[PDB]
């Protein structure tokens, strides 16, 4: 029955349930398995078969056919002319810098055709193309569907959510790149152009080879005025509408206007669209248009045949692909193009409005499947383009040819790794061209990290761009993409990671949805004619204008109730019925972001108390999301049906009998709570703080340090961070125990004092409890690990040994008997600075070293050593190394609100103050730092913190709970005998004088920064030196120096210190001594040891002047004489 | 005029040659060639190209970017660092090490 | 600035054979009376009163711009709609 | 403030509302919005210091 | 990962009260029944058991390096 | 929201404060409004400093 | 006034532009393709409503009453059928130079009655 005031646990409960039924990367995962599935088979299938003759002839030549389809694809296997070759684990591919791929396998089959009219046909099975890397957990990745234990036994983390891929043992991810919507029209206006209003579509057929053929249908800004045009793909110039359908093949007037005013009573469309009509009565018949589409044609023909040819194909393929490529389109196209016309004419007069860019309907998202389905067909283009280069080369002779060796494997491969290693998202060669930050290097310093890295969208615009209208935060991105998460750099608002339960769709065929529309009461285009037109509504499937309905209710009500019984329509298809204008659209694409709403009836919910009980005895009925689902309980709604639908935040609060708001509810939300993304749900109480303070904090979660995975150990990987102790909050939110905070948390509920206590927190700073340090609070562990291989030339054999002194010629200071005489350190051995840890000899043709030095300053301890095999079968080392942080002053602590700072001092526990107990506070923050960044989720933390380690209860911090409030907690904490505002009577601790104002303390939920002090700390007095200009290294590992930049100097100019400037431009960078002659000023020749000084083009050899000189300037004249330019300096 | 070793460094086995000395490679090949044909073929056809490309790599050995022109790139497809992209704006010689 | 724009609600135009056929029910044409297509602009009373014009001024300004390349024959500043005729001369 | 704000729509949704001089109807029904908000805001903060 | 051997803030032993407070979970006992059986007054004492997450668990699952 | 509602909780105004909490309209639209003073402090200085 | 309305030639179906038959002084549409003529009838070639007084009521249609989104009240009834309930709504249209002025819609569906208040 109806379920009043149990919300607050059915909607989690339910909640719950689509978390565990799907995960958390289910985006990455369905969209690699959909590509490896059948986009792959598409694309291998659609590629036409050549055919190749011999040259022309050989005295005074027949041809074959060479298809092939049917894709086979295997498990990953690893060995390769050494053993039988075995199954590749991925944590073996991450150990030994292996790529996690997996071979690929077709069938082909050549028929050739000589003489004789007979035909032989030789089919070659499991042709060998390449191997294809491959996502973990994914369907046919080696860890699918493996219970815990299983996991656990190959050394693998369960609560690992995959979605990645290994390659040369690093993980990488795809992050979905955004893009305009295809196949549907826009009208937009820029501001200053020859023309006013622009409408355009950029097409695509059914992921076809060819790309995005955007077509522009634009009216000019103003004799006669107003002309329509049509600049067109493969057309130089801009070309009027009524040509293109003449050319098209409509050679009345009346049909065109059919096509694109469909009720002629209106006269003010036809006062606009004459303008237009003037301008081309000279063309009259087809074949005219053709000509002057072709004139106008980036190859323009010779002759009118050619120009009509080329003009035809233009037509015919290149222009609105989706609508249809075949014999006989025109009709559908005209149809097509006549309502872009429509469209833009509607905006021109303003029966309608203009398209929004930034509407995320508007929007689709490239995930890992769509990505790597535009590149492998590019790269499968190129292998079949050398396939028959290869062909050629051996019919041209017709000897024969083998198609074993005609397959490039490498191609497809090494395309796919190399992209996916890189970033670099095209052909190798264009890497300046393809666009970069696609699959970068998985972000493994926290679990929310890895998720919030794995959930993560892209726009592809230009950063650094004062256009701030595409970062701002829309309002399409309500529960699907997370506002408070996003970095503070120059990537504010392009950069946006994805809400808790929004979902994005992975594309399907719309034929079954074709089939189904039309059977009930509907006509396609070639059927009826345009008088019928104007009175019903437009059907548009995926873009393309399908039909025309006269009865748009009942249909709309029958789409539903298909999609919501999953009969035909599947769940994630959207139907979209526009109501003042009448297009009715269907959307089945990929890339369309959604999320999962709840269906209302007259004012009820169908989500019943039957559902609730008979989904929370779940892993027994196993009544899970997707049966939920299946009983039409609730749908998924992306943007294009959200602008269509009225949304209730909670059933109880707004679907009662009150003064009417709406009353006409259709959907209502499980939990508002998941508009929130995955490093933003673990804000307690994030409605109570300023939305730049959670802004900050979503970003600081991805750099707290905790127990990252929980294999961190078998994984060999730099620059891992794990907390001793870390703790679940107290205070939590009800969406951490689906983020699996509680299981892998980053940070400790320490007690703290907002209080000015010395001073030396004054300025966002901090003060620590130096016992609670002592006993373990925040202590950390830092591994890094090194690696190294030995190979490269003829005779230039790396070898790992020990470097013998009276052998090899090259060495450092750093003792080397901390080596072992193969040439590493045995685990467990204390290491420091300037310390060889790989013994590494190339031979000298005695010999010269290449040993891995320890990094400067580190100063730690050999945890593990690791000795294996790389893919080329040499010897591959990679050790990892201990080295614990102590929390020290000026290290990075933070909280859950975006209130970080470094600590200023660390008291002892008797330095520190403390209430009627003995409890002293583990951290003291000033409270100069709540009033203006309003973080009062802060101090509401910090209440319920106590009051939650009182009760024994885990304190709850929902967002929108409404349950609880600070009366309520205050309340509860003045039960258990403290002051009910959470304040606390301090004493000093060097005087013991209870301090005059009452402390506010209590356990709040800090966490601990990877920016230690002791990693960015550094010096320099005449270290090392570059080599190209002799000025100081950058960088804190080589040693390098602060650069004096160009502010720098400015206010030392300002300070009017100009022996100070000198001093650092000149000697403290790079002193130099240079001689010219005194008749040019072109540097001469010195030889000093015989005091022989000429200048060439002079022959004088006794007037040289010695100047002294930056290197930088000696460099920058010498670069302007080889420019031929003759910088000229007299001393006089 | 050809820079010294001072203008373009050789770092030794990454020995590896700079990219403004593989252009002056680029410059000398061609040159050298041109200067051959020219007395022995004298053909006064392969002279044209052959002058118009030595013009290219030489006008992109102080200026790698022009419009219209293609880029003078290094193997795997990187472009070239002329004189002018050294010590043209920001991270340049004057700006940056000035 | 104020442009005719401004203070025009409509235009339209006619082919009047006859200037004195006066083929819109116009009693000020017939009492004031070479082409017969001829032009119509309707104004309104509220930004000329707005902008304080009159129609002698409106012409006036026409007949300095254009020459007498055209005779403009405006209505009355009585009757409720807001009329001036545009012909071309021959 | 609210009540305010409402009977103001509906003076401007009966075309009972009167666009100011040098403003549209739009920016005027905007500025008295503003206007009865910023005010509202104004005395619940004066009230807060009091 | 483990158990701390002595509360951050207070320094009272805690290493020892994790098994007994898990076998008290084990029975009808709520959190804030075990924390006080155990003897832990001051919430300082309190959260280091109630907001423990014992990842040791978790981390004996993998087999070892050696044998 | 209701198609055309100009009231004030349908256009940003806040009636709650940091301690009654935000309605989850409000968090969002305040979300949205402290983005603009985000993206403004990233983006100004590429201007401020030039 | 009115507006303008193009109707196209009955040979080949083709726009008609004006024409003057200068010997009897009368208009006449002309397509320019063939040597058809027609007398008009209305005798107005262009009109252009610079005011744009506009009468939304005709470009609103009647299915807009099933839109789940719009707001709906009982106070204002509709005229022809009497039905309580109303959908009312603004312009929705570019280019309305000052209009807040609601335009209201009835439900019942085969009513689809449209008035303004």
């Given at each position: 029955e109806i379920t009043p005031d149990l919300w607050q646990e059915a909607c989690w409960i339910v909640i719950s349930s689509y978390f565990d039924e799907k995960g958390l990367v289910r985006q990455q995962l369905d969209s690699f398995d959909e590509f490896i599935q059948m986009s792959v088979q598409r694309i291998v299938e659609d590629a036409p078969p050549i055919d190749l003759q011999a040259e022309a002839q050989h005295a005074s030549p027949p041809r074959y056919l060479l298809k092939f389809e049917q894709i086979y694809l295997s498990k990953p296997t690893h060995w390769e002319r050494d053993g039988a070759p075995s199954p590749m684990?991925?944590?073996?591919?991450?150990?030994?810098?292996?790529?996690?791929?997996?071979?690929?396998?077709?069938?082909?089959?050549?028929?050739?055709?000589?003489?004789?009219?007979?035909?032989?046909?030789?089919?070659?099975?499991?042709?060998?193309?390449?191997?294809?890397?491959?996502?973990?957990?994914?369907?046919?990745?080696?860890?699918?569907?493996?219970?815990?234990?299983?996991?656990?036994?190959?050394?693998?983390?369960?609560?690992?959510?995959?979605?990645?891929?290994?390659?040369?043992?690093?993980?990488?991810?795809?992050?979905?790149?955004?893009?305009?919507?295809?196949?549907?029209?826009?009208?937009?206006?820029?501001?200053?152009?020859?023309?006013?209003?622009?409408?355009?579509?950029?097409?695509?057929?059914?992921?076809?080879?060819?790309?995005?053929?955007?077509?522009?249908?634009?009216?000019?800004?103003?004799?006669?005025?107003?002309?329509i045009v049509a600049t067109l793909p493969y057309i130089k110039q801009e070309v009027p509408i009524i040509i293109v359908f003449r050319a098209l093949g409509f050679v009345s007037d009346r049909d065109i206007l059919e096509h694109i005013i469909y009720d002629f009573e209106d006269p003010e469309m036809m006062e606009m669209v004459k303008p237009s009509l003037d301008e081309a009565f000279v063309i009259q018949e087809q074949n005219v248009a053709l000509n002057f589409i072709g004139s106008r044609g980036a190859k323009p023909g010779v002759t009118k045949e050619k120009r009509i040819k080329y003009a035809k194909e233009v037509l015919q393929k290149e222009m609105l692909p989706h609508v249809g490529?075949?014999?006989?389109?025109?009709?559908?196209?005209?149809?097509?193009?006549?309502?872009?016309?429509?469209?833009?004419?509607?905006?021109?007069?303003?029966?309608?409005?203009?398209?929004?860019?930034?509407?995320?309907?508007?929007?689709?998202?490239?995930?890992?499947?769509?990505?790597?389905?535009?590149?492998?067909?590019?790269?499968?283009?190129?292998?079949?383009?050398?396939?028959?280069?290869?062909?050629?080369?051996?019919?041209?002779?017709?000897?024969?040819?083998?198609?074993?060796?005609?397959?490039?494997?490498?191609?497809?491969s090494d395309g796919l790794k190399y992209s996916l290693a890189?970033?670099?998202?095209?052909?190798?060669?264009?890497?300046?061209?393809?666009?970069?930050?696609?699959?970068?290097?998985?972000?493994?310093?926290?679990?929310?990290?890895?998720?919030?890295?794995?959930?993560?969208?892209?726009?592809?615009?230009?950063?650094?761009?004062?256009?701030?209208?595409?970062?701002?935060?829309?309002?399409?991105?309500?529960?699907?993409?997370?506002?408070?998460?996003?970095?503070?750099?120059?990537?504010?608002?392009?950069?946006?990671?994805?809400?808790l339960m929004a979902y994005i769709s992975v594309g399907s065929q719309p034929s079954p949805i074709l089939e189904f529309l039309e059977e009930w009461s509907m006509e396609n285009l070639e059927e009826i004619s345009p008088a019928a037109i104007a009175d019903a509504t437009k059907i548009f499937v995926n873009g393309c204008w399908v039909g025309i309905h006269k009865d748009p209710?009942?249909?709309?009500?029958?789409?539903?109730?298909?999609?919501?019984?999953?009969?035909?329509?599947?769940?994630?298809?959207?139907?979209?019925?526009?109501?003042?204008?009448?297009?009715?659209?269907?959307?089945?694409?990929?890339?369309?972001?959604?999320?999962?709403?709840?269906?209302?009836?007259?004012?009820?919910?169908?989500?019943?108390?039957?559902?609730?009980?008979?989904?929370?005895?779940?892993?027994?009925?196993?009544?899970?999301?997707?049966?939920?689902?299946?009983?039409?309980?609730?749908?998924?709604?992306?943007?294009?049906?959200?602008?269509?639908?009225?949304?209730?935040?909670?059933?109880?609060?707004?679907?009662?009998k009150e003064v009417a708001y709406c009353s006409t509810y259709t959907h209502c939300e499980i939990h508002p709570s998941m508009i929130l993304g995955v490093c933003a749900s673990i804000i307690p109480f994030p409605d109570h703080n300023q939305?730049?303070?959670?802004?900050?904090?979503?970003?600081?979660?991805?750099?707290?340090?905790?127990?990252?995975?929980?294999?961190?150990?078998?994984?060999?990987?730099?620059?891992?961070?794990?907390?001793?102790?870390?703790?679940?909050?107290?205070?939590?939110?009800?969406?951490?125990?689906?983020?699996?905070?509680?299981?892998?948390?980053?940070?400790?509920?320490?007690?703290?004092?907002?209080?000015?206590?010395?001073?030396?927190?004054?300025?966002?700073?901090?003060?620590?409890?130096?016992?609670?340090?002592?006993?373990?609070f925040f202590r950390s562990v830092f591994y890094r690990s090194y690696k190294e291989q030995e190979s490269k030339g003829f005779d230039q054999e790396e070898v790992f040994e020990k470097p013998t002194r009276e052998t090899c010629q090259g060495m450092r200071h750093a003792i080397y008997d901390k080596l072992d005489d193969d040439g590493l350190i045995a685990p467990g051995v204390r290491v420091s600075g300037d310390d060889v840890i790989i013994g590494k000899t190339v031979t000298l043709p005695t010999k010269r070293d290449c040993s891995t030095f320890l990094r400067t300053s580190e100063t730690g301890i050999v945890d593990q050593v690791m000795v294996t095999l790389n893919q080329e079968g040499y010897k591959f080392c990679k050790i990892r190394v201990r080295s614990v942080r102590i929390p020290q002053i000026g290290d990075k602590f933070a909280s859950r609100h975006g209130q970080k700072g470094t600590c200023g001092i660390q008291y002892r526990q008797e330095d520190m103050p403390f209430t009627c107990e003995g409890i002293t506070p583990d951290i003291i923050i000033n409270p100069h730092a709540i009033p203006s960044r309003m973080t009062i989720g802060h101090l509401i933390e910090c209440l319920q913190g106590k009051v939650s380690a009182n009760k024994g209860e885990i304190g709850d911090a929902t967002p929108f709970?409404?349950?609880?409030?600070?009366?309520?907690?205050?309340?509860?904490?003045?039960?258990?005998?403290?002051?009910?505002?959470?304040?606390?009577?301090?004493?000093?601790?060097?005087?013991?004088?209870?301090?005059?104002?009452?402390?506010?303390?209590?356990?709040?939920?800090?966490?601990?920064?990877?920016?230690?002090?002791?990693?960015?700390?550094?010096?320099?007095?005449?270290?090392?030196?570059?080599?190209?200009?002799?000025?100081?290294?950058?960088?804190?590992?080589?040693?390098?120096?602060?650069?004096?930049?160009?502010?720098?100097?400015?206010?030392?100019?300002?300070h009017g210190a100009a022996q100070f400037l000198r001093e650092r431009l000149f000697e403290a960078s790079d002193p130099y001594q240079v001689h010219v002659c005194n008749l040019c000023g072109i540097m001469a020749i010195a030889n000093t040891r015989t005091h022989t000084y000429e200048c060439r083009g002079c022959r004088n050899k006794t007037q040289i002047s010695l100047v002294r000189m930056p290197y930088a300037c000696k460099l920058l004249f010498q670069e302007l004489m080889s420019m031929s330019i003759a910088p000229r300096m007299m001393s006089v | 005029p050809v820079?010294?070793?001072?203008?373009?460094?050789?770092?030794?086995?990454?020995?590896?040659?700079?990219?403004?000395?593989?252009?002056?490679?680029?410059?000398?090949?061609?040159?050298?060639?041109?200067?051959?044909?020219?007395?022995?073929?004298?053909?006064?056809?392969?002279?044209?190209?052959?002058?118009?490309?030595?013009?290219?790599?030489?006008?992109?050995?102080?200026?790698?970017?022009?419009?219209?022109?293609?880029?003078?790139?290094?193997?795997?497809?990187?472009?070239?660092?002329?004189?002018?992209?050294?010590?043209?704006?920001?991270?340049?010689?004057?700006?940056?090490?000035? | 600035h104020t442009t005719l724009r401004k203070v025009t609600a409509n235009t339209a135009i006619y082919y009047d054979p006859n200037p004195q056929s006066t083929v819109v029910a116009e009693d000020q044409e017939w009492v004031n009376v070479i082409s017969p297509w001829l032009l119509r602009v309707e104004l309104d009373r509220k930004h000329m009163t707005d902008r304080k014009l009159t129609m002698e001024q409106i012409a006036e300004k026409i007949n300095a711009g254009f020459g007498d390349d055209l005779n403009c024959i405006f209505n009355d500043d009585n009757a409720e709609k807001l009329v001036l005729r545009i012909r071309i001369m021959n | 403030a609210k009540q305010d704000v409402i009977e103001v729509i509906e003076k401007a949704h009966n075309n009972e509302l009167e666009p100011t001089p040098g403003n549209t109807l739009r920016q005027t029904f905007e500025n008295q919005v503003n206007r009865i908000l910023n005010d509202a805001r104004d005395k619940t903060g004066s009230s807060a210091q009091k | 990962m483990i158990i701390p051997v002595r509360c951050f803030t207070c320094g009272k032993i805690v290493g020892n009260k994790w098994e007994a407070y898990l076998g008290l979970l084990q029975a009808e006992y709520t959190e804030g029944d075990a924390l006080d059986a155990l003897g832990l007054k001051r919430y300082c004492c309190r959260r280091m058991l109630l907001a423990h997450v014992d990842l040791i668990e978790k981390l004996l699952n993998y087999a070892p390096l050696e044998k | 929201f209701i198609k055309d509602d100009y009231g004030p909780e349908s256009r940003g105004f806040v009636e709650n404060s940091y301690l009654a909490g935000l309605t989850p309209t409000e968090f969002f639209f305040h979300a949205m409004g402290g983005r603009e003073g985000l993206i403004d402090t990233a983006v100004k200085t590429a201007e401020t400093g030039y | 006034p009115g507006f303008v309305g193009i109707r196209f030639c009955q040979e080949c179906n083709n726009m008609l532009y004006p024409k003057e038959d200068k010997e009897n002084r009368i208009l006449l549409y002309a397509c320019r393709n063939c040597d058809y003529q027609q007398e008009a009838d209305n005798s107005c070639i262009y009109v252009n409503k610079i005011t744009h007084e506009v009468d939304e009521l005709t470009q609103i249609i009647a299915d807009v009453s099933q839109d789940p989104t719009l707001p709906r009240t009982e106070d204002?009834?509709?005229?022809?059928?009497?039905?309580?309930?109303?959908?009312?709504?603004?312009?929705?249209?570019?280019?309305?130079?000052?209009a807040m002025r609601l335009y209201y819609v009835c439900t019942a569906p085969h009513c689809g009655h449209r008035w303004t208040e």
């Amino acid at each position: 029955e109806i379920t009043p005031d149990l919300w607050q646990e059915a909607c989690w409960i339910v909640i719950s349930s689509y978390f565990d039924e799907k995960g958390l990367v289910r985006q990455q995962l369905d969209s690699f398995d959909e590509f490896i599935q059948m986009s792959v088979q598409r694309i291998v299938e659609d590629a036409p078969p050549i055919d190749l003759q011999a040259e022309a002839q050989h005295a005074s030549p027949p041809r074959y056919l060479l298809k092939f389809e049917q894709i086979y694809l295997s498990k990953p296997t690893h060995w390769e002319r050494d053993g039988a070759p075995s199954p590749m684990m991925p944590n073996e591919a991450r150990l030994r810098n292996l790529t996690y791929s997996a071979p690929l396998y077709v069938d082909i089959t050549k028929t050739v055709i000589k003489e004789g009219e007979e035909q032989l046909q030789t089919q070659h099975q499991k042709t060998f193309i390449g191997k294809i890397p491959i996502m973990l957990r994914s369907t046919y990745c080696l860890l699918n569907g493996l219970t815990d234990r299983d996991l656990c036994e190959l050394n693998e983390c369960p609560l690992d959510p995959g979605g990645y891929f290994i390659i040369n043992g690093s993980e990488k991810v795809l992050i979905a790149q955004e893009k305009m919507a295809t196949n549907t029209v826009y009208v937009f206006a820029k501001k200053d152009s020859k023309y006013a209003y622009t409408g355009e579509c950029r097409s695509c057929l059914e992921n076809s080879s060819r790309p995005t053929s955007t077509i522009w249908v634009s009216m000019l800004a103003r004799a006669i005025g107003q002309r329509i045009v049509a600049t067109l793909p493969y057309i130089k110039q801009e070309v009027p509408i009524i040509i293109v359908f003449r050319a098209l093949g409509f050679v009345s007037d009346r049909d065109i206007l059919e096509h694109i005013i469909y009720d002629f009573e209106d006269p003010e469309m036809m006062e606009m669209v004459k303008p237009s009509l003037d301008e081309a009565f000279v063309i009259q018949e087809q074949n005219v248009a053709l000509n002057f589409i072709g004139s106008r044609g980036a190859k323009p023909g010779v002759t009118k045949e050619k120009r009509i040819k080329y003009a035809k194909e233009v037509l015919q393929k290149e222009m609105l692909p989706h609508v249809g490529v075949s014999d006989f389109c025109e009709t559908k196209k005209a149809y097509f193009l006549g309502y872009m016309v429509h469209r833009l004419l509607l905006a021109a007069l303003g029966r309608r409005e203009l398209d929004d860019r930034d509407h995320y309907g508007n929007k689709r998202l490239d995930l890992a499947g769509p990505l790597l389905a535009f590149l492998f067909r590019g790269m499968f283009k190129n292998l079949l383009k050398e396939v028959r280069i290869y062909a050629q080369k051996f019919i041209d002779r017709g000897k024969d040819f083998n198609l074993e060796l005609a397959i490039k494997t490498r191609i497809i491969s090494d395309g796919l790794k190399y992209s996916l290693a890189t970033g670099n998202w095209g052909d190798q060669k264009k890497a300046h061209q393809a666009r970069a930050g696609v699959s970068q290097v998985l972000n493994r310093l926290t679990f929310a990290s890895t998720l919030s890295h794995l959930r993560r969208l892209n726009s592809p615009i230009g950063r650094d761009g004062k256009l701030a209208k595409p970062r701002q935060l829309h309002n399409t991105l309500w529960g699907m993409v997370c506002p408070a998460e996003t970095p503070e750099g120059h990537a504010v608002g392009l950069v946006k990671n994805l809400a808790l339960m929004a979902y994005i769709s992975v594309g399907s065929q719309p034929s079954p949805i074709l089939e189904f529309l039309e059977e009930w009461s509907m006509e396609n285009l070639e059927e009826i004619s345009p008088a019928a037109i104007a009175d019903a509504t437009k059907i548009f499937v995926n873009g393309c204008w399908v039909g025309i309905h006269k009865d748009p209710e009942q249909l709309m009500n029958t789409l539903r109730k298909l999609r919501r019984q999953m009969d035909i329509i599947v769940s994630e298809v959207s139907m979209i019925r526009d109501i003042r204008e009448r297009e009715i659209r269907i959307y089945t694409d990929a890339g369309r972001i959604c999320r999962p709403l709840l269906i209302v009836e007259k004012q009820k919910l169908l989500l019943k108390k039957r559902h609730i009980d008979q989904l929370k005895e779940r892993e027994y009925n196993n009544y899970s999301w997707q049966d939920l689902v299946a009983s039409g309980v609730v749908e998924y709604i992306d943007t294009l049906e959200e602008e269509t639908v009225m949304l209730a935040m909670t059933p109880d609060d707004l679907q009662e009998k009150e003064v009417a708001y709406c009353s006409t509810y259709t959907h209502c939300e499980i939990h508002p709570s998941m508009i929130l993304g995955v490093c933003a749900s673990i804000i307690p109480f994030p409605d109570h703080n300023q939305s730049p303070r959670n802004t900050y904090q979503s970003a600081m979660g991805k750099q707290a340090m905790g127990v990252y995975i929980t294999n961190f150990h078998v994984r060999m990987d730099t620059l891992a961070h794990v907390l001793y102790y870390p703790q679940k909050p107290l205070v939590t939110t009800r969406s951490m125990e689906y983020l699996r905070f509680r299981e892998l948390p980053a940070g400790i509920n320490s007690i703290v004092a907002i209080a000015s206590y010395t001073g030396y927190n004054q300025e966002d700073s901090v003060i620590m409890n130096r016992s609670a340090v002592d006993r373990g609070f925040f202590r950390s562990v830092f591994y890094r690990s090194y690696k190294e291989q030995e190979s490269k030339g003829f005779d230039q054999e790396e070898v790992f040994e020990k470097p013998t002194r009276e052998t090899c010629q090259g060495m450092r200071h750093a003792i080397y008997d901390k080596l072992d005489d193969d040439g590493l350190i045995a685990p467990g051995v204390r290491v420091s600075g300037d310390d060889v840890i790989i013994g590494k000899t190339v031979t000298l043709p005695t010999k010269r070293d290449c040993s891995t030095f320890l990094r400067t300053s580190e100063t730690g301890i050999v945890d593990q050593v690791m000795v294996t095999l790389n893919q080329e079968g040499y010897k591959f080392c990679k050790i990892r190394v201990r080295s614990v942080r102590i929390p020290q002053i000026g290290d990075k602590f933070a909280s859950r609100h975006g209130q970080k700072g470094t600590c200023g001092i660390q008291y002892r526990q008797e330095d520190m103050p403390f209430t009627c107990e003995g409890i002293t506070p583990d951290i003291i923050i000033n409270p100069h730092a709540i009033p203006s960044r309003m973080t009062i989720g802060h101090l509401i933390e910090c209440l319920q913190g106590k009051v939650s380690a009182n009760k024994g209860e885990i304190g709850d911090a929902t967002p929108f709970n409404d349950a609880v409030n600070v009366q309520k907690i205050s309340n509860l904490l003045s039960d258990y005998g403290y002051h009910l505002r959470g304040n606390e009577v301090l004493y000093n601790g060097f005087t013991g004088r209870k301090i005059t104002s009452q402390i506010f303390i209590g356990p709040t939920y800090y966490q601990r920064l990877k920016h230690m002090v002791d990693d960015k700390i550094h010096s320099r007095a005449r270290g090392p030196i570059q080599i190209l200009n002799r000025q100081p290294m950058e960088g804190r590992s080589r040693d390098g120096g602060l650069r004096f930049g160009e502010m720098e100097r400015d206010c030392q100019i300002a300070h009017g210190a100009a022996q100070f400037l000198r001093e650092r431009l000149f000697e403290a960078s790079d002193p130099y001594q240079v001689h010219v002659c005194n008749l040019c000023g072109i540097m001469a020749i010195a030889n000093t040891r015989t005091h022989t000084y000429e200048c060439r083009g002079c022959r004088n050899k006794t007037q040289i002047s010695l100047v002294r000189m930056p290197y930088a300037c000696k460099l920058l004249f010498q670069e302007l004489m080889s420019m031929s330019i003759a910088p000229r300096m007299m001393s006089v | 005029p050809v820079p010294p070793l001072s203008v373009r460094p050789a770092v030794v086995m990454q020995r590896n040659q700079d990219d403004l000395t593989h252009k002056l490679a680029d410059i000398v090949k061609i040159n050298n060639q041109l200067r051959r044909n020219e007395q022995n073929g004298a053909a006064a056809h392969v002279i044209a190209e052959d002058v118009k490309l030595l013009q290219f790599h030489v006008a992109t050995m102080v200026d790698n970017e022009l419009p219209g022109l293609p880029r003078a790139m290094q193997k795997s497809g990187r472009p070239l660092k002329s004189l002018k992209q050294r010590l043209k704006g920001k991270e340049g010689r004057v700006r940056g090490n000035l | 600035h104020t442009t005719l724009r401004k203070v025009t609600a409509n235009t339209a135009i006619y082919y009047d054979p006859n200037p004195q056929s006066t083929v819109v029910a116009e009693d000020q044409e017939w009492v004031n009376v070479i082409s017969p297509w001829l032009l119509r602009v309707e104004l309104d009373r509220k930004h000329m009163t707005d902008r304080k014009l009159t129609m002698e001024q409106i012409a006036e300004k026409i007949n300095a711009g254009f020459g007498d390349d055209l005779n403009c024959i405006f209505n009355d500043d009585n009757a409720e709609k807001l009329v001036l005729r545009i012909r071309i001369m021959n | 403030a609210k009540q305010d704000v409402i009977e103001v729509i509906e003076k401007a949704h009966n075309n009972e509302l009167e666009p100011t001089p040098g403003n549209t109807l739009r920016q005027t029904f905007e500025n008295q919005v503003n206007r009865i908000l910023n005010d509202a805001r104004d005395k619940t903060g004066s009230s807060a210091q009091k | 990962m483990i158990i701390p051997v002595r509360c951050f803030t207070c320094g009272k032993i805690v290493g020892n009260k994790w098994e007994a407070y898990l076998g008290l979970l084990q029975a009808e006992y709520t959190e804030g029944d075990a924390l006080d059986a155990l003897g832990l007054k001051r919430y300082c004492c309190r959260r280091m058991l109630l907001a423990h997450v014992d990842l040791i668990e978790k981390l004996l699952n993998y087999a070892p390096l050696e044998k | 929201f209701i198609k055309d509602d100009y009231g004030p909780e349908s256009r940003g105004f806040v009636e709650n404060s940091y301690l009654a909490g935000l309605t989850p309209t409000e968090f969002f639209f305040h979300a949205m409004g402290g983005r603009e003073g985000l993206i403004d402090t990233a983006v100004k200085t590429a201007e401020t400093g030039y | 006034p009115g507006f303008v309305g193009i109707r196209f030639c009955q040979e080949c179906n083709n726009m008609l532009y004006p024409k003057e038959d200068k010997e009897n002084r009368i208009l006449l549409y002309a397509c320019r393709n063939c040597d058809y003529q027609q007398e008009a009838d209305n005798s107005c070639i262009y009109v252009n409503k610079i005011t744009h007084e506009v009468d939304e009521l005709t470009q609103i249609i009647a299915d807009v009453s099933q839109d789940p989104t719009l707001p709906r009240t009982e106070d204002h009834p509709c005229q022809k059928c009497g039905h309580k309930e109303a959908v009312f709504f603004q312009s929705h249209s570019a280019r309305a130079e000052d209009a807040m002025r609601l335009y209201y819609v009835c439900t019942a569906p085969h009513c689809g009655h449209r008035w303004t208040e």
